[PDB]
């Protein structure tokens, strides 16, 4: 599914993930924008050291979901990356809180530095109800 924004912001906030960790919905929308362009679906091999990121927040399989063919690997969130490929968002979002609650924040996606960091994010929840 390839989310529309403000129908992806209103349904980030009804999942608390509004100022989760210190984190506002305007960082994490841009987080989604750049990481998978609002999709679902969107899957990206690293072929440099055989991991994939999943689903709409790019959740790399190393270390926070399971897909079985990533070399020295671990499940963080305990999830199958299946689960991440999904419409119904809930699983990337309960992942994605979990990325977070290590110290690095939102700086764990390097997407978020080059991007997001230290500009003017209110566009992307700008109209939206939330």
Same mark, same amino acid.
């Given at each position: 599914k390839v989310f529309?924004?403000?129908?992806?912001?209103?349904?980030?906030?009804?999942?608390?993930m509004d100022g989760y960790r210190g984190i506002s919905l305007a960082? &994490?929308?841009?987080?989604?924008? &750049?990481?998978?362009?609002?999709?679902?679906?969107?899957?990206?091999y690293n072929a440099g050291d055989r991991s994939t990121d999943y689903g709409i927040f790019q959740?790399?399989?190393?270390? &926070?979901?399971? /897909?079985?063919?990533?070399?020295?690997?671990?499940?963080?969130?305990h999830l199958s990356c299946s689960a991440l490929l999904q419409d119904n968002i809930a699983d990337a979002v309960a992942a994605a809180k979990?990325?977070?609650? /290590?110290?690095?924040?939102?700086r764990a996606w390097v997407a978020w530095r080059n991007r997001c960091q230290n500009r003017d994010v209110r566009q992307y929840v700008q109209g939206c109800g939330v």
């Open positions: 529309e924004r403000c129908e992806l912001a209103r349904t980030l906030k009804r999942l608390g960082n &994490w929308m841009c987080l989604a924008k &750049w990481e998978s362009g609002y999709n679902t679906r969107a899957t990206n959740v790399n399989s190393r270390y &926070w979901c399971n /897909d079985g063919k990533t070399p020295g690997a671990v499940n963080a969130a979990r990325v977070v609650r /290590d110290p690095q924040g939102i």
